[PDB]
Structures are given as structure tokens and as C-alpha cells.
Amino acid sequence: GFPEDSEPISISHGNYTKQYPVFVGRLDIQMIMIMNRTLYVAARDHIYTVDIDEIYCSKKLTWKSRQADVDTCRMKGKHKDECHNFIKVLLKKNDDTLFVCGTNAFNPSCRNYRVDTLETFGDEFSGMARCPYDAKHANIALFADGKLYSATVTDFLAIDAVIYRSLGDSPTLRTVKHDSKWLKEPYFVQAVDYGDYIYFFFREIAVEYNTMGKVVFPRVAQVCKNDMGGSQRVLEKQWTSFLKARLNCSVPGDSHFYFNILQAVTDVIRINGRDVVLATFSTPYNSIPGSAVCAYDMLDIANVFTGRFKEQKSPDSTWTPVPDERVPKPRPGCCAGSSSLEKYATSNEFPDDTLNFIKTHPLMDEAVPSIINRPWFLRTMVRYRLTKIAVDNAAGPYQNHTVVFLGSEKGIILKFLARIGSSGFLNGSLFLEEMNVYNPEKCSYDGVEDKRIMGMQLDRASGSLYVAFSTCVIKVPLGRCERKTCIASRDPYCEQDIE
Amino acid sequence: GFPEDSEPISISHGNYTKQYPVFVGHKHRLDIQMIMIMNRTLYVAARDHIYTVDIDTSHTEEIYCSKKLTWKSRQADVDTCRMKGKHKDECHNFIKVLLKKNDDTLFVCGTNAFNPSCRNYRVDTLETFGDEFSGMARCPYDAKHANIALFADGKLYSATVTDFLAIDAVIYRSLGDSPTLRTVKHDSKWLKEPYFVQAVDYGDYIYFFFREIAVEYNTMGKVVFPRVAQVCKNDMGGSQRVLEKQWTSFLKARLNCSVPGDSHFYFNILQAVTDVIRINGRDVVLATFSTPYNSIPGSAVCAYDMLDIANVFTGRFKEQKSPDSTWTPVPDERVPKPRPGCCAGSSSLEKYATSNEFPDDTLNFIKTHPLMDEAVPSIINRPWFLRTMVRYRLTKIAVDNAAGPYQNHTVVFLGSEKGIILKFLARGSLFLEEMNVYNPEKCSYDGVEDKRIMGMQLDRASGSLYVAFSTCVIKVPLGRCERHGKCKKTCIASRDPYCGWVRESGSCAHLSPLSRLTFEQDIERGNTDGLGDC
Ligand SMILES: *[C@@H]1O[C@H](CO)[C@@H](O[C@@H]2O[C@H](CO)[C@@H](O)[C@H](O)[C@H]2NC(C)=O)[C@H](O)[C@H]1NC(C)=O
Ligand SMILES: *[C@@H]1O[C@H](CO)[C@@H](O[C@@H]2O[C@H](CO)[C@@H](O)[C@H](O)[C@H]2NC(C)=O)[C@H](O)[C@H]1NC(C)=O
Ligand SMILES: *[C@@H]1O[C@H](CO)[C@@H](O)[C@H](O)[C@H]1NC(C)=O
């Protein structure tokens, strides 16, 4: 008896949400992020800023592609609408430096800007492998210890999907070119900084099924922060700690129902004493639509990489565990400078047997279990899929509720509470709100009505959740209280029974 | 994207269907197991009784019982049943097998409080004659279990469990003055926790349809596959060295019901299967499938040509060369002669008068390889009907292939877990009707509303579909032609083969065999050009 979708304990409509403030500058919004007290809007040609304290553009950055780049782009058969500069990487390098990469008419490049003035600093440089050529593509970029971690394609034809590290005075490292054991048509979702590792969350064609046709799996991948590459013999200029595993997001039973299409992942956040990520999953395109929110314990992620490795004995075999006696000493995947690998100053010093093993065996046998071994949330027979995810784990007057905000491709935002009262149970989440937030009258212009939520930033200070569409940014209040007997909603933002 | 649910041309709610005649057992929770039409008699098999209902009599609000068969369990079986730890509600004689043996004899088996047994009964008198015999492997112990029974050339073909614990699932043949045959005991290559759905007589074979755990797909968990399997009607079993007193023709294959894409989406859980129906020059079965009970609920109807079914069993056999290697096709060079699964007396096998004369090579191979490599394609390689945005699954199925005044339309009736019947025209398919036929006031017995459809029997002569829930049977008119009354537009637009505009009465009506009147309808196009709404 597969869990039946509960209904929201509050629905809101374009009727109500209509009057929420909107930012408009077609804009072609690529992403948004809050830093300190300013919302950043990354779009075509520009990055606008909004003082979070109609919505007005308080300052804007400007970076238009040179005409020769546009012509070059056009001359490769690209349509005029995509041969512009679309900002696709936006990070703080430090307190003074914004790091900005644009598609730049299918000619990726990166630049440093100044936080305070938005003026240019230093000169531009190749964005190859740091930024996509195509604004339509999903990308990852993140700084850790000054090193830039990125995931995108290296090439104009988008065939060379890469997980890459460059900058920060360390060697540049990449995944093995065209090695489908490493990467098979990935789609990049998220990267997090944790402990000794960067963790990448993406989806790819599952080789575990290369016998049985086209199946997409959700993956988490590990890299050692201190990776220096291989020796001159094996894996030179390439990762030596790359390991990946299937994520497990399922409703269990005598047969398990897997949600395999990874949509979004949160940053690492703290819940019930644990460091976790929350991830939104969907059923594939060709299926009965369904979405799930599973949570993952950083420890469960870590533990998976200590388990057995996967192999395929012959082209006619199922994928099986490697018996431990065939695993070389030192064990692949551990970071030089740690327990029993103290004798290796760097990965450059790792032996051949270790480096050859990890080159050929990047996939772990086990799948990462989720916390509670089931989703915390489900949405099944609706004509939309859950995409973006923003959390507030300090919700309410006593700052102790975990409210999760979920977006969709149709401009719908769901809101739910993960934990009810002081007990700490997580097996009974409450569906607080289903709401349509997309505003046709302020967002549908320049021949474009697209309702895909491009991103969303939660801002406790200003009590609002900023929602990005392609052409507009909507300022939604975290709760709907004004709508009497308003204790009925069990909304921690609004005495109040939530029992 | 993924094809979304179309809406029915006409809708019929519980407040309207409530007038349909209902049988509840007057002339006590019924626990109806199955219904069966024979000639002009509707047989209702239930707990301790088979009720009969005359199909002719134009009934009122209530349908009444004409005569009655009584078979309550012996007290000793009831008490042994409770001694073995079964609940009180479980320890009764539920009738689960009912077949016409001949013109005079009804063959009946009942769970008998977890001690199955069979008797012969006379049609007219409904009283037993002859000794009782064992229902072991002919009828289940447990009422909630699904089972198959069928006669052909006098042989009884049954599919069920032999044991109280329900571990030894079997496909079985006995009686008919022929040998007794079973599927090999505890061999998971033959059957693995099967769920028996339907058996069919066709050509020189009996075809069984069921779901079981997939041995081909034992990686990521237990997965259930739907199957069709064949036996030779003339199977005599093997010889002393191989398959003695066992099938020598048993072969099975995956059934493909899927919506194609980059990744195909399967409906794997076989729900129901029709008898063989003739449709535009083709002999076919129609089958309902759902997504597993633990997934987002979806249902599908797929059709299978008996020729494609037969064709799969001539293709290549599957094998697993090594414990954790994948399942591959056996190359023909390794297939012995005579070919495993060929009936003695058939082309190039006529040399063999009997399966007991098959060589060991043949028998050993079929014992080892009962699974065909290929899956049975459905007709046009996609479902004729899908339900994907509803909280019910589609189960039972009834087809009328001679619908309309010219008896040339194909109308399909679908039942469900929630008392809803759907009606579509096969041709893609045209969603005519959705009706809730469950009657709470006549079918709820205590608190309980068990809205599951136990069986449907279509009766063309009386223009009725009989719908069984576990506590009542509802007499459902094939069409709701009366609804439209004097409105020609809606009457035509309904595009229902059972309904027409009758010029002389100036109204919509059910289109008679007594077609002594003009009967306008447009099924093919539905063209309403020139009519105004009412
Ligand atoms: C995904 O997670 C679930 C829950 O941890 C796993 O389900 C277990 O699977 C085993 C073997 O099938 C069962 O015997 C257990 O009873 C299941 N656990 C629960 C809590 O139901 C499932 O196997 C995982 N999938 C993968 C591929 O690792
Ligand atoms: C079930 O049927 C579908 C549809 O016939 C099969 O999908 C086809 O498979 C062929 C051969 O592998 C492909 O080249 C075609 O592209 C597929 N057709 C379509 C319309 O996509 C599918 O293989 C069958 N499934 C099984 C298990 O046999
Ligand atoms: C939050 O704090 C309040 C105030 O004491 C307490 O009553 C409530 O149970 C707490 N809720 C959670 C989820 O910790």
C-alpha cells in the first residue's frame, strides 16, 4: 500500500500571491544568490544587485560579449538568442573578490570583480572547464581552500563532460577523458565542501545496467581536497581519489520504488545533531510523474566509500563486489596524510597498483542509504516535478523548526515541516503549503512565458524567500498568516498548536 | 512527456446507478468468490453456497435467488482450521472452482476450511453425486488466494498450491482418463512465487497467464514479471529417466506491456486476462496490468495476438551461463531435436506417438530451460488504454466484440479496486464511459465498504454486464442511452455503439435486435454538424 499523497493544510493561488514584489531590471536569469545583505541576480550581460533591506536594481554589473565573439558564435550555427554573455559562475573568492564566469557567446571566460563597486579587477582568462559554453547547460562551481572545483563540459560540442579542479596554487586535475566508467553523460546538480573532501552530486547513465538499456542513476562522488594527481606512470594530472556511488532514494517494500532522477541538493546543514544534505528526486520523463525528498547523512556518504568496490568480470556479467583480497594496499580513495597512509606526503607518491585500481574501479558496490530509509516527503499524481530546494532549520519564534521550501518547473512552491514539536521524530512531516507564485502580468513579457524556477534563496533576516524565474524575481513572505482563526495553519511563522 | 489521461465522453455518478438491480442473497456476509454465466443462468460462487440467478426475468430494485447449492465445511475441518492458527473468518468452505464438466455435471471445489475438496453436482437439482475427492492441487486452501481451473478434452487443468503453507505452487492436470502431470516441485526456474490469473484453450495448447518473481531480473531486488505459458493438450509426461509424471511441453515468456521511450516504462503486475476474442481477423486476449503495489499507481490494457504468443515459443530459449552472469539466448545449435515444446504428432515429431518417447536430450533441456529469451510484443507495441492519474488500479475485464446494430464494434469494460467501471471502444481507443456502480446501501454489510470488483460477466442477450463485489452482484445495462432522452446531439456525440436516435419515438434508445425502426448513430466520426444543444 504505497503512501498516499496528503493534501496541503493551506493552498495559495495567483489570486493571493499576485501582489508580492517583483524585480524586473527579457532578463534571462541564470541564477541568484544572497551574500551578506545583497541579492545577486546573474543574467545575460549583467549581474544586478538588490538591497534586501516593486523591487529596484540598486547596482548592476555589465559584461557584454565583444562583437567578434558573437560573430564567431553565429558562424558556428548558433542562434542569435544564445550568442550572448550569460553569467553561469558567481562566487566570493574572498571578502573583496567576486569570481564571475560567462558563457560569452560559446567562448567561456572568467574574471575577477570587486565586491564593493562591481568594477573589473585584473584581466579575463579562459573559462574552459570552469564555465559552460551553453546557458542551457547545468554547471557546478565552488571554491575550497582557494582551489576552484567545477563541473561542466570542456568543449563546444558538449561531449567532454568534466569534473575539474584548477587555481589555488595546486595542480589542475580532471576526470579521465572519455572514460565512461568515470562519467557517462552526467548532468551536474551540486557540490559541497565537507571535511577532507569535496562531494559532487550528479546524474548519469548507470553502467550497472549497461546490459539492459538506458537507465539514469543519482550519484554522489568523492574527491580528496589534497589530491595532487597521479605519478608519471598512472593518472598524471588526473584525480587519484575519485569515487562515486549511487544514491538510494526509495519507498521500501517487497519491491522498492526508486526515484532515480536527481533534481537538486542543499548545502550541508545541521539537523538532529547530524550534518545532512536534503535532495529532491523525480521519476524519469517516460513514467508516471512522482517526486521525493530524501535526506542524507554526511557519515552515510563517507561510509559508502569505505565499503566494497564494484566490478564487471566480463562483458556478459552483472556488476558484482570485488573481494577485499583483490584490493591493493594502500586502499584507493583515502587521502594522503591520513591513517596508515601517513607515509605518503602526496598522491604523486602512491604506488602503481593503487592508482591503476582506482582508475579502473571508480564505482562503489553499495548505495547510500537515506536517513529513515525512506523519503521525508512525497508528491505523486501532479503534473509537475519537484526541483529546487531551500531550507530554514531555525524557523519560528524559538528558532527550532525545519521548514523545507520546494520549487517546480511550473512555478509551484511547496512548503513542509520536517519535525513536529520537541520529540525529534522525522517520520511524520506536515504538508504546510502548496502555492503558485508565478506572476504572468509582471513576468510574461518579450514573447516569453517560462515558469521554470531557476533558483531560490531563503532570507531569514527579511522573512522572505526569493524566487527566480527566467524573466523576474519574486519576493515571497516565508508564511501566509494574514489569511480569523489563523492558528489553524500550524505555520511556525505565525500560542500555536502544531501537535 | 508521458501520455496523460483523457476524459470520458460521458460520466455516471453513484446517485444515478443506485437504481440498478442488486443481488444480495434472498429468495450474512456473502464473500463472493466469482461469478459465471452458463446458458441463461448466472452462477454466484461464495461461502458455503453457489447461488443461481435467472438472467431473463426483468428484475426490480432487487434480484432474487432461483435455486441454491449448500456446502458448509465439516465441523472437524473448521476446528482443525482454528487449531492450525487461522482466524474464525478464514475457516469456512469458500467455493473457488466451478466448471461445466458436461451438459449435466457441475464440477465444484471449495477451500473447505483449509482442507480443499471437490465434488460433482447435477445442473438441474444442484445436489451432489458420487464420492468427494481431494481438492489438493485443484483448489486452494486459502480464500484470498488466486487460482485457475479449466476443462479441455475432459482433462482438468488447475493452477494453485498443493500445501497448507502455500509454498508448493503448481500447474496441474488430472482426470480425463489421461496421466497426472505437474510442474517440477520446488524448481524456481519453472515457477517462483507465482500468482495465477487466467488459463485459455487455444490451438493444440492450454495457455496460462500469471505473474511471478523474475529470475532474469534478480539484481536490484525482487521484481515481478507477467507471464504467458504453454502446455500441449496432449502431453503424456516423460519417461523413467526424465520428467516422469511431469510436463514435457511447459514453456513460458515475459509479456511486454510498455509505453516506449529512452527508458521504457513497464506495467509488470498482471491483473486480468480475457478469453480469446476474435477482432478484425485476429485472435487475441486483452490484459490489464498495473504498476507494483508499492509505486505511483498506474494501470494499462494491452492486447496480445495469439500468433505472437505462439511465435515467441518457437524463438530462442534463455540461459544463465554462470551464477552472476546475465541471461542470454541459447544458440539454436545447442537446441536438441525434437525441439523442446513441440507436441508429439506435430510437424517432424509425428515419428513420436507420445511424449513418453521423447529422447532424454529433449526432456533434460526443457527441464532446464522453461523460459523463452524473447518477450511477447503487444499489438501495436503499446497499451490501448491507460489510467495514470487516479487512486485506483484497473482489474477485471469484459469484452463485447459484436456490439451495435451491425454487431461489428468492439467494446471493452474495465473494473477496478474502487467500484468504478470504465468503458472504451477498441479500434487510438475511445473513452466512452466512467461509472461508479457500487451501491453503498445494498453492498455495505456491516461497517465495511469493500468496493473491489470480484468478477464481471457480460451477457449480450439481456444487454447487461453483471458486476460482482464480495457482498452483492449488480445488473448493469451496457449503455445509458436513456440519459439523453429527447436530445439528439448528446445521443449522437456519445458515440456509443449501444445507443442511437430512434426517429419514430423521437428519442435516444438502446439499439435493439428488434431493429424494426430507424436507428441513427455516428460511431466512426461522431459528426454532430447541424444539431443544437438541449
Ligand atoms: C535502498 O534502501 C533500502 C532501505 O535501506 C534497502 O532496502 C533493504 O533491502 C534489503 C534487501 O533487499 C531488505 O531485506 C531490507 O529489508 C530492506 N530494508 C528496509 C528498511 O526495508 C534497499 O536495498 C536499498 N537499495 C540498494 C540498491 O542498496
Ligand atoms: C517491449 O516493447 C517495446 C516496443 O516494441 C520494445 O522497444 C523496442 O525495442 C527495439 C529493439 O531493442 C528498439 O530498437 C526499439 O527502439 C524499441 N521500440 C520503441 C517503440 O521504442 C522493448 O524492447 C520491449 N521490451 C522487451 C523487454 O522486450
Ligand atoms: C521549540 O521550542 C519550543 C519552546 O519551548 C518547544 O515547546 C517546542 O517543542 C520546540 N520545537 C522543536 C521542534 O524543537
Ligand SMILES: *[C@@H]1O[C@H](CO)[C@@H](O)[C@H](O)[C@H]1NC(C)=O
Ligand atoms: C459496421 O457496419 C456498418 C454497415 O456495414 C458500417 O457502415 C460501419 O462502418 C461498420 N463499422 C465497423 C467498425 O466495422
